[PDB]
Amino acid sequence: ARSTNTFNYATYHTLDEIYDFMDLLVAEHPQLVSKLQIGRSYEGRPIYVLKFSTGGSNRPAIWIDLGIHSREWITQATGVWFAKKFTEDYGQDPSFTAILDSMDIFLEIVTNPDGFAFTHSQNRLWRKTRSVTSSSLCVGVDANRNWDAGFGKAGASSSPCSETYHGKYANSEVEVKSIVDFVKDHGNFKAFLSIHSYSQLLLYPYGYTTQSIPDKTELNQVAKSAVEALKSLYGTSYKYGSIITTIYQASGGSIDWSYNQGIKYSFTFELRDTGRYGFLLPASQIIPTAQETWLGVLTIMEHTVNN
Amino acid sequence: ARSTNTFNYATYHTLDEIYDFMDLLVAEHPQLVSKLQIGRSYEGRPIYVLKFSTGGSNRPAIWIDLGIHSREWITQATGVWFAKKFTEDYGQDPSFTAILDSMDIFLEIVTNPDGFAFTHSQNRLWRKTRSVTSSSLCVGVDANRNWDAGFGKAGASSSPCSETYHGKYANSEVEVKSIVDFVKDHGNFKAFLSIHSYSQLLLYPYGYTTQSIPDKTELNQVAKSAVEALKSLYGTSYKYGSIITTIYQASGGSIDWSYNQGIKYSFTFELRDTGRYGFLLPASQIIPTAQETWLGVLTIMEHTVNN
Amino acid sequence: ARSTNTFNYATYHTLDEIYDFMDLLVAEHPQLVSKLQIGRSYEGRPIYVLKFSTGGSNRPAIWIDLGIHSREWITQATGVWFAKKFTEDYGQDPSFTAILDSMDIFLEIVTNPDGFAFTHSQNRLWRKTRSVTSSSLCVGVDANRNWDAGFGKAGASSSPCSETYHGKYANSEVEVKSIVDFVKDHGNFKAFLSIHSYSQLLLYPYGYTTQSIPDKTELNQVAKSAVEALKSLYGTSYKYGSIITTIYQASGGSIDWSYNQGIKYSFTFELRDTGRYGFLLPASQIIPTAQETWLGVLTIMEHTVNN
Ligand SMILES: O=C(CO)C[C@@H](Cc1ccccc1)C(=O)O
Ligand SMILES: O=C(CO)C[C@@H](Cc1ccccc1)C(=O)O
Ligand SMILES: O=C(CO)C[C@@H](Cc1ccccc1)C(=O)O
Ligand SMILES: [Zn+2]
Ligand SMILES: [Zn+2]
Ligand SMILES: [Zn+2]
Numbered sequence: 001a002r003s004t005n006t007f008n009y010a011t012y013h014t015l016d017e018i019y020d021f022m023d024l025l026v027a028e029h030p031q032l033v034s035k036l037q038i039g040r041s042y043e044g045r046p047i048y049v050l051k052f053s054t055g056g057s058n059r060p061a062i063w064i065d066l067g068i069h070s071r072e073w074i075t076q077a078t079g080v081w082f083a084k085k086f087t088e089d090y091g092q093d094p095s096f097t098a099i100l101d102s103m104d105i106f107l108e109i110v111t112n113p114d115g116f117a118f119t120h121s122q123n124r125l126w127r128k129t130r131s132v133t134s135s136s137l138c139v140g141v142d143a144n145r146n147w148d149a150g151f152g153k154a155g156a157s158s159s160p161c162s163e164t165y166h167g168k169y170a171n172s173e174v175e176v177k178s179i180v181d182f183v184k185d186h187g188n189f190k191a192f193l194s195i196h197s198y199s200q201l202l203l204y205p206y207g208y209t210t211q212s213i214p215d216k217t218e219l220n221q222v223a224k225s226a227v228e229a230l231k232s233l234y235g236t237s238y239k240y241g242s243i244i245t246t247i248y249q250a251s252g253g254s255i256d257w258s259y260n261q262g263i264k265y266s267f268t269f270e271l272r273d274t275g276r277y278g279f280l281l282p283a284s285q286i287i288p289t290a291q292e293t294w295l296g297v298l299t300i301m302e303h304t305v306n307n
Numbered sequence: 308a309r310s311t312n313t314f315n316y317a318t319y320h321t322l323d324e325i326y327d328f329m330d331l332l333v334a335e336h337p338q339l340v341s342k343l344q345i346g347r348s349y350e351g352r353p354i355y356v357l358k359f360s361t362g363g364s365n366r367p368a369i370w371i372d373l374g375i376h377s378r379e380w381i382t383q384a385t386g387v388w389f390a391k392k393f394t395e396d397y398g399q400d401p402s403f404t405a406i407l408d409s410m411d412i413f414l415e416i417v418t419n420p421d422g423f424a425f426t427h428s429q430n431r432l433w434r435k436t437r438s439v440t441s442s443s444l445c446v447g448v449d450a451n452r453n454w455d456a457g458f459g460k461a462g463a464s465s466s467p468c469s470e471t472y473h474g475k476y477a478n479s480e481v482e483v484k485s486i487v488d489f490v491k492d493h494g495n496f497k498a499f500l501s502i503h504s505y506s507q508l509l510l511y512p513y514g515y516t517t518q519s520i521p522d523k524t525e526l527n528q529v530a531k532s533a534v535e536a537l538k539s540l541y542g543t544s545y546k547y548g549s550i551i552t553t554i555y556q557a558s559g560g561s562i563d564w565s566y567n568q569g570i571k572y573s574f575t576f577e578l579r580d581t582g583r584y585g586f587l588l589p590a591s592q593i594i595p596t597a598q599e600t601w602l603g604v605l606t607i608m609e610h611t612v613n614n
Numbered sequence: 615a616r617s618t619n620t621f622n623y624a625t626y627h628t629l630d631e632i633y634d635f636m637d638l639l640v641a642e643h644p645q646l647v648s649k650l651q652i653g654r655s656y657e658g659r660p661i662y663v664l665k666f667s668t669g670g671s672n673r674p675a676i677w678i679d680l681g682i683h684s685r686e687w688i689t690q691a692t693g694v695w696f697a698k699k700f701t702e703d704y705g706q707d708p709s710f711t712a713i714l715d716s717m718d719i720f721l722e723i724v725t726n727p728d729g730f731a732f733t734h735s736q737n738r739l740w741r742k743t744r745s746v747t748s749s750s751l752c753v754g755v756d757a758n759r760n761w762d763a764g765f766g767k768a769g770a771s772s773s774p775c776s777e778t779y780h781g782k783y784a785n786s787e788v789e790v791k792s793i794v795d796f797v798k799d800h801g802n803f804k805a806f807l808s809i810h811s812y813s814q815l816l817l818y819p820y821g822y823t824t825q826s827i828p829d830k831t832e833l834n835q836v837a838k839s840a841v842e843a844l845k846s847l848y849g850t851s852y853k854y855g856s857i858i859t860t861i862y863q864a865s866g867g868s869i870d871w872s873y874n875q876g877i878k879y880s881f882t883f884e885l886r887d888t889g890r891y892g893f894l895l896p897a898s899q900i901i902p903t904a905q906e907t908w909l910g911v912l913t914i915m916e917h918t919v920n921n
Contacts, residue, residue, distance in 0.1 A: 002466040014555065020469045027468065044505065044582030121555045132581075461801070518653075518795040 004028055009081050009290075011283045012073055015045070015117050018109060021080055022048060029087045036106075039178030042131040043114045047178050052086050053104040062191040062301055063183060063263075065108040065254070068143045068175070069127040070115030072197035074271050074281045074289055079109035079195070081290035082297075096298060099305050103190070106182075112143055112175050125279060127163060129173050136160040141167035144194070146176045149256035150208025155249035166252050179254075183261065191265035191304045192258035193297060198278055199247070199270040200238045202227050202296065205259040207243030207250035215264055216242070222303050223267065230296035234288055236272065238296075243268070265304050269293065311335055316388050316597075318590050319380055322352070322424050325416060328387055329355055336394045343413075346485030349438040352420040354485050359393050360411040369406075369498040369608055370490060370570075372415045375450045375482070375561070376434040377422030379504035381578050381588045381596055386416035386502070388597035389604075406608050410497070413489075419450055419482055432586060434470060436480050443467035448474035449559075451501070453483045456563035457515025462556035473559045486561075490568065498572035498611045499565035500604060505585055506554075506577040507545045509534050509603065512566040514550030514557035522571055523549070529610045530574065537603035541595055543579065545603075550575070572611050576600060618642060623695050623904075625897045626687050629659070629731050632723055635694055636662060643701045646714075652722075653792030656745045659727045661792050666700050667718040675718040676805040676915055677797060677877075679868070682757045682789070683741045684729030686811035688885050688895045688903055693723035693809070695904035696911075710912060713919050717804070720796075726757055726789050739893060741777060743787050750774040755781035756866075758808070760790045763870035764822025769863040780866050793868075797875065805879035805918040806872035807911065812892055813861070813884040814852045816841050816910065819873040821857030821864035829878055830856070836917045837881065844910035848902055850886065852910075857882065879918045883907065 001007040001017075004024045013021070026033050032052060039047045053059065066079035086105065089096045099105075110116050114130035128140030138161035145156040148170035152158070156166035171177040183189055204219040206212075213219065223240040231237060243250055259266040272289045273281050281289070308314045308324065311331045320328075333340050343356045360366070373386035393412065396403045406412075417423050421437035435447030445468035452463040455477035459465070463473035478484045490496055511526040513519070520526065530547035537545055550557055562573035579596045580588050588596070615621050618638045627635070640647050646666055653661045667673065680693040700719065703710040713719075724730050728744035742754030752775035759770040762784035766772065770780035785791040797803055818833040820826075827833070837854035844852055857864060869880040886903045887895050895903070 002468075016464070016469075016471055020464055020466060020471070023468060024466070040582070040585065042582055044580070044585035117555070121553075460799075516795060517798045519791075 004084055004087075007080075007084070009084065010287050012077055012286070013080070014120050015110060015113055018076065018080060019048065021083070022050060022109075025050070025083055025087060032087060032090060033083075038182045039174055041112075041114045041175055042129055042173070045113045045117070047113065047175065048108070048110070049182070050083055050107045050109070051104060052100060052107065054090075054100050056104075058186065058188050059102065059104045060188055060190045060304075061104040061106055061186065062193070062304060063106050063189050063258070064193045064195065064297070065111045065179065066195040067109065067116060068111040068194065068254070069196060070112050070119045071125045071127045071279045072271075073119070073279065074197045074286065075195045076110055076116065077286045078271065078290040078293055079107060081287065082294065083107060083109065085290075085294055095302060099301050103301075103305055108179070111179070115140070128165065129175055131173060133160070133168065141165050141173050143173050143176050144196075144254055145250065145252040146171065146173045147252045147254050147257040148180070149253060149260055150251040153208055153251040155208055155251035170252065180257070183258070189258070189263050191300060192255060192263045193266075193300065194254045194268040195271065195293075196268060197271045197281070198273045198275070200236060200272060200274055201246060201270040202238050202240040203243045203246055203268045203270070204255070205242060205266055206256050207247070207253045208256050210244055212242070213259060219265070219267070222265065222300055225303075226267075226296040226299040229299040230292045233292040233295055236292055265300055267300060269296070311391055311394075314387075314391070316384075316391065317594050319384055319593070320387070321427050322417060322420055325383065325387055326355065328390070329357060329416070332357070332390055332394060339394060339397060340390075345489045346481055348421045349436055349481055350421045352424070354420065354482065355415070355417070356489070357390055357414045357416070358411060359397075359407060359414065361397075361407050363411070365493065365495055366409060366411050367495055367497045368411045368413060368493060369500070369611060370413050370496050370565070371500045371502065371604070372418045372486065372561070373502040374416065374423060375418040375501065376503060377419050377426045378432045378434045378586045379578075380426070380586065381504045381593065382502045383417055383423065384593045385578065385597040385600055386414065388594065389601065390414060390416065392597075392601060402609060403605065406612050410608075410612055415486070418486070422447070435472065436482055438480060440467045440475065448472050448480050450480050450482050451503075451561055452557070452559035453478065453480045454559045454561050454564040455487075456560055456567055457558040460515055460558040462515060462558040477559070487564070490565070490570075496565070496570045498607060499562060499570045500573075500607065501561045501575040502578065502600075503575060504578040505580045505582070505588070507543060507579060507581055508553060508577040509545050509547040510550045510553055510575045510577070511562070512549060512573055513563055514554070514560045515563050517551055519549065520566065526572070526574070529572065529607055532610070533603040533606040536606040537599045540599040540602060543599055572607060574607060576603065618698055621698070623698065624901055626691055626900070627694070628734055629724060629727055632690065632694060633662065635697075636664060636723075639664070639697055639701065646701060646704060647697075652796045653788055655728045656743055656788055657728045659731070661727060661789065662722070662724075663796070664697055664721045664723070665718060666714060666721070668704070668714050670718070672800065672802050673716065673718045674802050674804045675720055675800065676807070676918060677720050677803050677872075678807045678809065678911070679722040679725045679793060680809040681723060681730060682725040682808065682868070683810060684726050684733045685739045685741045685893045686885075687733070687893070688811045688900065689809045690724050690730065691900045692885065692904040692907055693721060695901065696908065697721055697723065699904075699908055709916060713915050717915075717919055722793070725793070729754070742779070743789055745787060747774040755779050755787050757787050757789050758810075758868055759864065759866035760784065760787045761794070761866045761868050761871035763867060763874055764865040767822055767865040769822055769865035784866065794871070797872070803872075803877050805914060806869060806877045807880075807914065808868045808882045809885065809907075810882060811885045811895070812887045812889070814850065814886060814888055815860060815884040816852050816854040817857045817860055817882045817884070818854075818869070819856060819880055820870055821861070821867045822870055824858055826856070827873060833879070833881070836879065836914060839917075840881075840910040840913040843913045844906045847906040847909060850906055879914055881914060883910070
């Protein structure tokens with residue numbers, strides 16, 4: 001694809017194709033999108049974040065990370081679609097235009113690039129990072145159990161060979177630390193959304209503790225509205241609630257960390273399919289999944305701009 | 308640097324310094340080394356191949372190209388070290404002497420001179436050539452995706468702005484065509500090695516197709532022996548296998564082309580570092596990298612002169 | 615004969631005659647047909663596939679292989695008729711024209727050339743390949759039990775001397791691997807049809823397992839429609855259903871592998887005669903068999919192109 005207009009949004013792509021997509025979008029929309037490198041993965045690959053901004057100096061922002069778990073392909077595919085959609089709707093959709101005229105959006109399409117490359121090369125269902133450490137044959141850490149929020153507590157594994165291994169210590173994975181450093185340095189994020197795949201859930205803060213967040217009433221209603229918006233398109237039904245009460249106790253998670261940094265609108269999406277295809281979601285569902293998910297994300301952003 | 312005996316092999320050099328090195332070596336070893344110009348780069352720079360021979364009539368040959376991707380500095384530096392090593396060991400080391408007594412070695416230290424100059428003056432991480440495509444504000448082609456081997460197929464980009472742009476057509480880049488004409492004209496190459504950097508891999512034919520080569524068993528055995536030899540010095544671990552099965556589909560590759568030309572011992576080395584420094588490998592690792600890589604290359608040469 | 619217009623379609627031909635037929639057809643219809651060599655048989659004979667295309671780039675395709683079991687002569691004879699039929703109907707039959715205007719068809723008339731030559735020279739009833747086994751006086755493998763789909767499981771023999779020997783490992787036979795690599799590299803096949811002889815059956819996925827495929831309802835109806843079309847010409851009755859429930863458990867089959875690759879419309883045809891003549895079907899039945907079988911095949915293609 002020599003243009004984001006020739007890019008096939010209805011098919012799954014490789015890391016190279018997505019990184020190329022990034023430069024095309026920036027070239028095509030220079031006054032709106034820029035590519036930031038926030039670090040290097042364990043295997044030295046650049047970690048890229050697309051910044052959508054219409055100006056200002058460190059305006060209130062919205063963070064959206066996708067693909068932290070490499071095998072959740074629908075998320076990177078949705079991230080690419082999101083990127084294009086932002087450039088299409090700014091100046092077209094009144095609501096989204098209003099958001100971008102006052103806030104910035106930071107989009108990380110491939111949060112775990114080493115694992116992503118690996119899902120294309122050796123193992124389609126690989127989910128962890130590709131870090132190697134100390135004395136252990138096994139490789140990789142579950143980057144979404146590596147954050148400094150109840151790190152190492154029940155809801156994560158201490159075995160390096162486990163699919164839910166949390167890592168040696170909090171923020172040990174550069175893919176996670178890079179985000180932590182960027183967000184802390186920025187200091188003005190109002191929303192933090194982490195996109196994952198399958199189970200069709202919209203969850204809010206704390207998977208590591210049964211303690212209820214101070215903003216439970218509001219986040220719960222925002223979630224309810226977001227799920228209804230998402231559903232209005234194709235009838236896809238999502239369940240919502242706090243992580244621990246909806247799926248199970250899970251520690252070292254990204255939104256528990258962001259919420260604890262004071263980022264109020266922290267939510268995690270588990271995208272399409274309830275098990276029919278699971279992680280192997282057909283490419284024919286990429287666009288429909290992205291479209292409906294966008295409605296839910298926009299709903300959250302709208303509550304962020306006026307709150 | 309008035310002598311190859313005073314040349315600093317432990318530091319990175321410029322095109323001029325490496326080109327000057329070539330003449331010093333030829334002047335110091337006239338009966339063994341000669342400098343051949345196989346063409347000119349897009350920007351007019353001479354393309355040099357050092358020929359190591361002890362006589363004969365176009366004896367079976369070994370081709371070794373380095374620096375096709377300009378930013379992979381460890382390769383050009385290793386290429387210089389190799390040139391010096393050949394002159395030191397011939398006549399002294401039994402094995403290498405035997406190899407050069409029946410075979411010639413053609414060494415191209417800087418396969419992409421324009422890109423190399425660019426990495427020193429404008430962009431340290433530039434990797435493509437510097438050709439101007441007429442209809443694009445972008446520059447260069449990925450020279451190792453421009454070969455006539457599955458050209459234009461999946462594993463390369465058709466976008467002139469891509470870092471993996473394959474180019475207008477097979478062999479469009481003069482840096483590639485120069486090698487193709489040279490090797491075809493020669494007609495008696497038995498080995499073809501392409502040196503690249505970082506990931507620590509030794510790969511054999513076909514990145515453009517899942518078809519396993521007819522000589523898979525043999526090249527896999529050669530690779531295994533080569534990696535063990537390389538590892539024996541400092542413990543550096545390399546993985547090996549076909550390009551597509553080890554990494555991923557990649558088209559327009561040099562060894563896919565050479566192998567299809569009937570050059571059986573076609574391999575590509577991805578030198579040191581697994582990501583700690585990536586392309587910015589410290590100068591302090593130049594000599595050790597060259598030393599260990601030499602053992603691997605020698606191993607391949609030995610399997611070529613006997614089989 | 616110097617023209618496909620004077621070619622005798624009502625008689626059985628040799629490998630050479632069929633291969634010459636291919637060139638005549640390509641010479642007469644250069645804008646529609648091309649000859650591709652996808653590999654070399656065990657005994658080094660070229661393996662050819664006829665590509666029918668009206669243009670495009672990697673257009674959705676339909677794969678058709680015949681003669682994988684050498685003694686099933688009615689299949690290769692039907693393949694030749696098929697090739698001619700496509701060149702006669704494109705631009706004449708609205709339905710077929712529509713299929714070729716959006717899709718490509720790859721036809722392999724003699725999937726097992728070594729065996730085919732053997733059925734003409736030494737044993738008319740030979741069905742396996744002609745590969746030589748290390749420690750055995752017996753020759754060949756049942757190419758349709760050598761695919762990587764339940765390979766080595768119940769429904770095949772591990773004894774080299776058996777007529778249903780599955781081989782040393784999945785894809786051991788180059789005749790099979792050649793198709794696997796081609797189809798995998800292509801990546802855009804929508805239908806995979808394997809043509810065999812006698813029993814008059816149309817079967818869909820899984821002979822190696824009783825597990826029902828996800829698309830069972832659709833394929834069963836497509837099969838029902840295909841057999842009705844086939845029967846409509848001369849009244850030839852075909853039975854349909856899954857391989858395992860219709861014939862018996864059989865492992866390493868082509869359509870089980872193709873379906874598992876994501877190629878939905880995977881069917882196997884067992885042509886004319888239910889036992890009267892068996893493999894020795896009279897040449898006088900070649901054209902009638904080909905004609906009626908075409909209606910069944912066209913039916914599947916129509917379902918493949920639409921939706
Ligand atoms: O994406 C998921 C599985 O597909 C759900 C997440 C849930 C989770 C959330 C926070 C911390 C750890 C785990 C997981 O278990 O890793
Ligand atoms: O040097 C490399 C990156 O530093 C790895 C090579 C791997 C490759 C090898 C052969 C053909 C195409 C690609 C590349 O992707 O260009
Ligand atoms: O064509 C056939 C015999 O004439 C039926 C096929 C049935 C089969 C189908 C799938 C896998 C293996 C065998 C065979 O047994 O070789
Ligand atoms: Zn996840
Ligand atoms: Zn390289
Ligand atoms: Zn058969």
